[PDB]
């Protein structure tokens, strides 16, 4: 029948962000990131797979692996891996053993750490930042970070204002671009300052045309001649190009879109109506055939919110369908076959082979046999319409042993659009143990924000947020991007309560990042939620305005101390603490002044609240926005268990992750105000 | 005499440590002199024969503190740092150092990565504090012990205390040890870092050694034999304490256990004076004095007859004493007079002279300094000094620059607590007349003390609007009324006049430029108080001024006073020299620039990217460039004078773009 979920199961759910298929298509390699208890952090397990037979051989375990590709012209592979000495460029031979290729002897420190460069991640050293092969595999382009060595200098004006939010010492780096010829000689193309985000962040696009190699920089698209060794300064650099050579896009609103391709001269060509959205970062991405007559694009459908593939060619648009979602996919050179990761809400991930000609999906071995032995929970995909007329997709996750005529306490978990068809996606659940809540008898409602692509009202308000000013009115910006989401949660809880599924007396809500903002807005604007947990928040608070000016100016119209202050007092949650009757827990990695402002405001208002600040590996390190430390991930999941058990169920937990706490939570309940 | 240079203001020595032998025939003092090779100050230890006057140079070190004479012997003891961290050393009667107590693993401290923030220059401290027993047989000392444990999850007030962190910190505890005459050491107790008196008071009674700990305070006693624990300055001969009444001009000195010693011309027990010392028998004491008016430091002898103060022709800052309080060796200091060592006979009140401290500064032609006080429109007087330019004749107009830090304008030689990075000596040599002016003295009126009490207390009375007036706004008027008074005499050109200051003086510079049209240019060193960005950290000190939070119903008090919101009232050139890079300092810069005011903020770094610069600059490369930037700033804006000596050349072009974009 299968065993129930445990806490370590949610921790060890593997992530596959790297999969590569050989050019001939007979071999493939992929790496599964799995949380390691002995290491205290995740480690990537590299595995080779025979596409024909289905045999999977475990090769080697490393720290990190990125940019996994197949070397053109050979049967080998290349990747950026870290063995603990810093990220370098390695070659994996056709039999699956890795040996160094390019090694920076002086890798610079990166991430949130003392004396490190704030790239934009887990603390580590990066020897080789990015690389790409030429189409024939003869030439190798790569970039590496070089720590700028000079004495500390006086800084002036905007140099000083950029240091406002600094929590730690930092260093300064430059980005070197190198090119190696077929003879093994390397020459430096150019150097770029840290101010270039295209060069520092890496992972960018680079094209090979004739004698030139072209890539992107920020001070343009720059070109380097292989022989002349000269530098000079198009939509060919853009993702999502079609078989005709134009830009792919989807137009329309509401239920279905229309997939079109616009040529560089501006003449559009429509492939007809489509039920899906194009080019999501969580989908399979995009790939073009060598001849350019066939492309594949990753898709995310409206409604069911499933990921898949779509084939574009001269005749039109055709998408192959599967019984689950295809997230990450490899392809061969001819685009005639693919190896993908098949994923679903309650079904663990599996490797599958896809023949793009016949649309036949042949199944391969499962990725995590540990999670195949777990009895799948009951999940029902459902969309809810609110009082403002907006629909929000999501999932209703039932408790174990649920039978009809059962009332259960509920917990709402929301992050962005990330509630979809995928297996235990950490971008959604975060530290909230959605699986373990159901085993203990909770109904977990996974619900997104109202999808902005349904209505012109939500798109115009979202545009003003990214733009940094109106129109529309900042008063409506608060309504469309925040307040109407509170209504979508209240109307979804009462709708299930009218069906007898949920006890309205006991209902929780949780979220982080975008979901943290939703939690902080609902708790102020709604009495319907008894307990709440806001992961790593701080947006919308007045303490973070100076850093976030352009993002705040759309919501509040201006500074907190300007004439717009009355907008700050009506909306911002830290000023609204008097409207809050609920239990607000803050799980905080960053310890920003905006999160502390929300804590000191709720505590001064008599509201029962606690802020939990999880540290890094040492005193010189921090924790990433999503927790990469297992000891922090496990205790954060248990803290949410103990928090929602105490306030919703009046249940004291013997497994509580921190001692002498429930004692303190009693003193908070005794001090609650009359309101 | 040769004229002042920029390196002379840098190399002016500080002596914070002087000790006289028990018999009184030998003495030691340490002179802190900025070193160009080391790029920071280094202390030169020197031994002195008071009879002959010979001064022998023993050894140069990094830092030295707590220099005392070991009771019962002819040797001394001090906390010195040779580069391996601060430890406790012994100085034998011939003047050579050898270790006494050495902590093999000192903890890093200061503003630095992976360091503990006591509350200073980055370094390692092996031995924190020490004190001898009266007989010298017992030795009490404390040392910092780095707390070793993994990082943990913090909750509630643990998180809020980290709001203002710029760097990674470690945690320590303070161990207290006691060494018996046989040489065996026993640990008295351990205190957490939250104890301030332990990290930053010991008495000896019988078999007990008593000190003070904070938990909010307690007095505990350790038994030297039983080895058990339990809970239980400025003293006169009769045992009663010493306080001063008699406001206004003179003062009355009283000893209260209610004796009265009569009228006195000075105030009592300032940190800048010689301090306090009591005789063994207890019939004679000596106290450091600071006089009203002339603002000179000196000594006062109290006995079973009365109070008698000895007077010299200059100020005595640091003084050592012998066991019987019959003699003293002191540092004689003056405004235009370089420091010099002197011996004082306390019985006969005669001062015999010894060699100079800094022969480098004895060859400089003394500038003309005139002590002068000014009365403002509010009826308050502000002491200070006016310093004439070189080659000045009567009936000459000159451009002016006002430099203010606290009460620190007084009779002393180039005190860095006052001038800071503003080169008042080199400004006079270049044709500037510099007015060194203090705040209105708070001891002159009950209106100033009551407002000062509310600031320290963190709430009224008096009214917050009067706290802005008494501690700030009336100091603006003192500057304006003193400038127009000198302009009426023909000394000062009112069109071109500067103002500068740091810390307290930075706050005065920020309020004047907002509340006054009289000053053309301004330089505010390492400021940020009174700004709304620093409320969450400084709540108590801010609550007195503004009455509450910036977003509360007190906002209208913030909009009228706080300089960041008043930038529209600023027509001037405001420069910020900034070590800390606080969010309050950045808020002041972003506010002035957004209002069209010409302004610039200069952020000076530490030795490494892992270290910071202290409040007063200890890095010679940072001090020299900070002095040059002020000259180039005031020469450009006041005199329209472009400088070929400018420290950063890219600026004067940018300053032109600031001048062209000025509003009306």
Three-state DSSP at B395 gives: coil
User: What are the residues facing B302 on neighbouring strands?
Assistant: B285, B307
Task: State whether A152 and B605 contact (CB < 8 Å).
Answer: yes
Q: How many CA atoms lie within 13 A of A409 on its CB side?
A: 22
Class of the CATH domain delimited by B369-660: alpha beta
Q: Which of A224, A221, A204, A142 is nearest to A179 (CA)?
A: A142
Flag whether residue A597 sits within 8 Å of chain B, measured between CB atoms: yes
Tell me B221's DSSP state: E
Contacts of A156 in chain B (CB under 8 A): 600-603, 648, 651
Region of B591 (left: φ > 0; alpha: ψ -120 to 50; beta: rest) is: alpha
Task: State whether B160 and A597 contact (CB < 8 Å).
Answer: no
CA distance B127 to B100: 11
Flag whether residue A546 sits within 8 Å of chain B, measured between CB atoms: yes
Task: State whether B587 and A152 contact (CB < 8 Å).
Answer: no
Flag whether residue A647 sits within 8 Å of chain B, measured between CB atoms: no
A135, A33, A626, A535: CA torsion to nearest 10: 130
Query: A611 to chain B, minimum CA–CA distance in Å?
Result: 5
Q: Which of B112, B153, B154 to mutate to test the interface with A (most CBs of A within 10 A)?
A: B153
Three-state DSSP at A551 gives: helix
Phi, psi of A329 (to 5 degrees): -140, 140
Contacts of B603 in chain A (CB under 8 A): 154-156, 159-160, 163
DSSP string covering A102-151, please? E--SSPEEESSBTTBB-----SEEES--EEEE-TTSS-EEEEEEEE----
Query: A383 to chain B, minimum CA–CA distance in Å?
Result: 38
Query: A603 to chain B, minimum CA–CA distance in Å?
Result: 9
Question: Who contacts B325 (Cβ-Cβ below 8 Å, separation ≥6)?
Answer: B277, B278, B279, B284, B285, B286, B346
Contacts of A618 in chain B (CB under 8 A): 151
CA distance B383 to B402: 13
CA distance A360 to A340: 13
Three-state DSSP at B345 gives: strand
Query: A332 to chain B, minimum CA–CA distance in Å?
Result: 47
Residues A629, A635, A636, CA angle at the centre, nearest 5°?
Answer: 85
Flag whether residue A611 sits within 8 Å of chain B, measured between CB atoms: yes
Task: State whether A588 and B159 contact (CB < 8 Å).
Answer: yes
Task: State whether A164 and B586 contact (CB < 8 Å).
Answer: yes
Which resolution, in Å, applies to this structure? 3.2
Which of A154, A575, A593 has the CB atom closest to B603's CB atom?
A: A154
The domains of chain B are located at 103-150+168-232, 369-660
DSSP string covering B85-113, please? -EEEEEE-TTS-EEEEE--SSPEEESSBT
CA distances from B186 to B139, B176, B181, B189 (A): 11, 9, 12, 9
Flag whether residue B604 sits within 8 Å of chain A, measured between CB atoms: yes
Which of A160, A167, A613 has the CB atom closest to B159's CB atom?
A: A613
CA distance B478 to B473: 9
Burial A662-675 (b: 16+ CB within 10 A, else e): beebeebeeeeeee
DSSP string covering A14-62, please? -EEEEEEE-SSSSEEEEEEEEEETTTTEEEEEEEEEETTT--EEEEEEE
Task: State whether A575 and B551 contact (CB < 8 Å).
Answer: yes
**Tokens 């907190």, residue located:** A560
On whether the CB atoms of residues A593 and A544 are closer than 8 A, the answer is yes
Flag whether residue A153 sits within 8 Å of chain B, measured between CB atoms: yes
User: What are the residues facing B217 on neighbouring strands?
Assistant: B214
**Tokens 């070659």, residue located:** A91
Reported for B636-641, long-range contacts at CB under 8 A and 24+ positions apart, including other chains, are B637/B498, B637/B520, B637/B521, B637/B573, B638/B399, B638/B401, B638/B496, B638/B497, B638/B498, B638/B520, B638/B521, B639/B399, B639/B496
Flag whether residue A656 sits within 8 Å of chain B, measured between CB atoms: no
Q: Which of A147, A156, A152, A117 is nearest to B606 (CA)?
A: A152
Question: Who contacts A175 (Cβ-Cβ below 8 Å, separation ≥6)?
Answer: A129, A143, A144, A145, A146, A191, A192, A193, A194, A196, A199, A200
Token digits of residue B37: 């090779």
CA distance A572 to B45: 60
On whether the CB atoms of residues A537 and A512 are closer than 8 A, the answer is yes
On whether the CB atoms of residues A599 and B159 are closer than 8 A, the answer is yes
**Tokens 């540990």, residue located:** A370
Three-state DSSP at B487 gives: helix
Token digits of residue B80: 């010195």
Flag whether residue B581 sits within 8 Å of chain A, measured between CB atoms: yes
Q: Does domain A377-670 have CATH number 3.40.50.12280?
A: no
On whether the CB atoms of residues A587 and A614 are closer than 8 A, the answer is yes
CA distance B100 to A431: 55
Token digits of residue B548: 């509450």
Residues A528, A532, A537, CA angle at the centre, nearest 5°?
Answer: 125
List all residues of chain B from 614 to 643 with a beta carbon under 8 Å from chain A.
Answer: 622, 625
| CA max distance for chain A | 80
Task: State whether A154 and B586 contact (CB < 8 Å).
Answer: no
DSSP string covering B574-614, please? EEEEESS--HHHHHHHHHHHHTT-EEEEEE---SSTTB---
Query: A147 to chain B, minimum CA–CA distance in Å?
Result: 13
Three-state DSSP at A224 gives: strand
């Amino acid at each position: 029948k299968g065993r129930p979920w445990t806490l370590e199961d949610i921790l060890t759910v593997p992530e596959v962000n790297e999969i590569a298929l050989s050019d001939n298509g007979r071999l493939a390699i992929y790496a599964a990131e799995i949380a390691d208890l002995d290491a205290g952090k995740p480690r990537s397990h590299i595995r080779i797979v025979d596409v024909e037979t289905g045999r999977t051989k475990e090769l080697l375990t490393v720290d990190t692996i990125k940019s996994l590709r197949s070397v053109p012209g050979t049967q080998d592979w290349s990747a950026l891996v870290d063995l603990g000495e810093g990220q370098q460029l390695y070659r994996i031979d056709t039999e699956g053993k890795l040996l160094p290729l390019i090694v920076n002897p002086n890798p610079v420190p990166v991430g949130k750490a003392d004396m490190s460069f704030p790239l934009g991640i887990r603390p580590s050293h990066i020897g080789i930042l990015d690389y790409d092969w030429s189409p024939d595999g003869k030439w190798l382009w790569y970039s590496q970070l070089r720590a700028k060595s000079d004495g500390p200098r006086v800084r002036f004006d905007e140099e000083v204002t950029a240091l406002l939010g600094r929590r730690r010492s930092t260093i300064d780096v430059e980005v070197d671009f190198f090119l190696r010829n077929p003879e093994g000689d390397t020459t430096r193309i150019m150097a770029r300052p840290s101010t270039d985000r295209v060069a520092t962040r890496g992972g960018g696009r680079v094209l090979w045309r004739g004698n030139e190699v072209q890539f992107r920089i920020e001070t343009e698209f720059v070109a380097w001649n292989r022989v002349n060794r000269t530098v000079r300064t198009l939509l060919s650099m853009s993702i999502l190009v079609g078989p005709r050579g134009g830009q792919l896009s989807t137009s329309g609103l509401g239920s279905d879109r229309e997939l079109i391709e616009t040529s560089a001269e501006g003449r559009p060509h429509s492939y007809g109506r489509v039920a899906f959205d194009i080019g999501d970062s969580r989908s399979a991405g995009w790939k073009r055939s060598r001849d350019g007559k066939r492309v594949v694009i990753g898709t995310r459908g409206l409604g069911d919110a499933r990921y898949g593939l779509a084939l574009i060619d001269k005749t039109g648009v055709r998408e192959l369908r599967a019984d689950a979602s295809l997230t990450r996919c490899g392809f061969d050179g001819m685009l005639r076959s693919a190896i993908c990761v098949e994923e679903g809400m309650s079904r663990p991930p599996r490797l599958v082979r896809v023949d793009l000609g016949t649309d036949k999906i042949t199944d391969l071995g499962p990725i995590s046999p540990r999670h195949e032995e777990i009895e799948p929970l009951q999940t029902i995909a459902r969309t809810f319409v609110s009082r403002d007329g907006y629909w929000s997709s999501g999932y209703v996750l039932l408790p174990r042993g649920h039978r009809a005529a059962d009332r259960h306490p509920a917990v709402v978990v929301t992050h962005g659009t990330d509630a979809d068809d995928r297996f235990a996606e950490p971008a959604n659940q975060w530290n909230y143990p959605v699986q373990l809540l159901a085993e203990r008898g909770y109904v977990v409602l996974l619900l997104n924000d109202p999808s902005p692509g349904q209505s012109k009202d939500l798109m115009d308000a979202m545009h003003a947020w990214l733009r940094g000013k109106g129109p529309p009115d900042p008063e409506t910006v608060q309504q469309k991007l925040w307040l109407t989401g509170v209504h979508s949660f209240e109307d979804a809880v009462t709708e299930l309560a009218a069906e007898g599924l949920i006890d309205p007396a006991r209902v929780g809500i949780a979220g982080y990042s975008r979901g943290s903002q939703m939690v902080n807005v609902t708790v102020t604007n709604s009495k319907m939620f008894r307990a709440a947990s806001s992961g790593d928040g701080g947006f919308l608070e007045p303490a973070g305005y100076a850093t976030g000016r352009s993002s705040y100016d759309a919501v509040y119209g201006g500074a907190p101390l300007s004439d717009n202050i009355e907008r700050w007092r009506r909306f911002a949650p830290s000023l609204n603490a008097d409207k809050v009757c609920a239990a607000v827990l803050q799980q905080v990695a960053s310890a920003s002044p905006s999160q502390i402002e929300l804590f000191e405001a709720l505590r001064a208002a008599g509201v029962a609240t606690q802020i939990s600040y999880y540290p890094g590996a040492t005193a010189a390190s921090d924790e990433t926005h999503v927790f990469y430390l297992t000891t922090n991930r496990l205790r954060a999941m248990r803290e949410n268990i103990a928090w929602f058990d105490y306030w919703l169920l009046d249940k004291r937990d013997a497994d509580a992750p921190f001692p002498d706490h429930v004692v303190k939570w009693d003193r908070l309940k005794k001090n609650l105000p009359d309101r």
